[PDB]
């Protein structure tokens with residue numbers, strides 16, 4: 001098992017393109033990922049109730065099956081996350097449907113990953129939700145991550161809103177209107 | 178999807194070692210696989226009732242997740258089979274258990290694969306069940322496969338018993354006594 005702990009910011013200003021310019025000198029670009037996620041639900045156990053998620057991701061052609069458990073924090077996005085790469089997205093999707101899972105919703109995004117010391121900064125252009133930043137810390141406590149994010153937004157003059165909602169949950173709310 | 182069609186023989190005589198000698202000249206050895214399979218069940222949908230199977234296989238370190246559907250034939254072992262390779266057995270097993278699946282039983286065997294024209298002959302040493310042969314045909318109808326197996330056992334003087342039961346089912350019956 002693995003505990004994924006990150007902070008998610010909804011960017012108000014400036015654009016991600018401008019933010020990319022402000023970090024370009026002191027942050028090292030890692031890669032850009034085009035991610036297409038298919039989320040699933042269990043008809044006999046509502047994941048929206050138990051705060052669980054099951055996702056089949058296509059990121060630059062690499063196919064990843066991810067389980068996510070209930071949130072463990074209110075101040076950061078902290079969840080158990082178990083991931084395995086699979087050989088074929090179509091077939092894995094078929095197996096889930098043969099086992100009784102139902103496709104729920106789809107999330108597509110362009111993620112740009114940057115590295116600063118032990119932190120990973122993800123600049124996220126979410127289709128239909130807008131611009132977001134996710135920050136993760138390697139071997140970092142929740143206090144350290146919160147502190148670094150505060151320095152990050154201040155140093156780069158980012159107006160923002162923190163949220164612990166997943167992209168799947170934000171998409172649903174954005175679809176309400 | 179994919180329809181796996183094979184004939185399974187319980188070998189009465191001679192030994193698989195002796196059978197290996199009788200086919201050695203005209204059959205080409207492909208590989209030998211050490212296979213450790215973990216079977217699963219769904220508590221809300223009994224696979225023993227619906228004739229389904231879910232298996233995580235370790236074959237020479239390669240990890241394969243396989244769904245198998247209900248049998249479609251009475252004269253050969255014919256089932257829908259959807260397979261994907263996954264990166265990590267432990268993690269995939271965890272995901273299944275997090276999703277509610279329960280490990281059912283385990284099957285371990287040494288499989289030796291041979292090739293004759295469009296047919297694959299598998300000599301199987303099943304731990305606790307004994308010696309078996311499985312024969313599969315590439316682009317072969319059910320009539321062709323049955324006919325080839327009849328020639329195969331006759332040419333190599335194999336005493337045998339055909340069965341359409343899966344190894345999981347045979348293991349359960351063998352455990353009854």
Ligand SMILES: [Mg+2]
Pocket residue numbers: 006134
């Ligand atoms: Mg995230």
Ligand SMILES: [Mg+2]
Pocket residue numbers: 183311
């Ligand atoms: Mg078989």
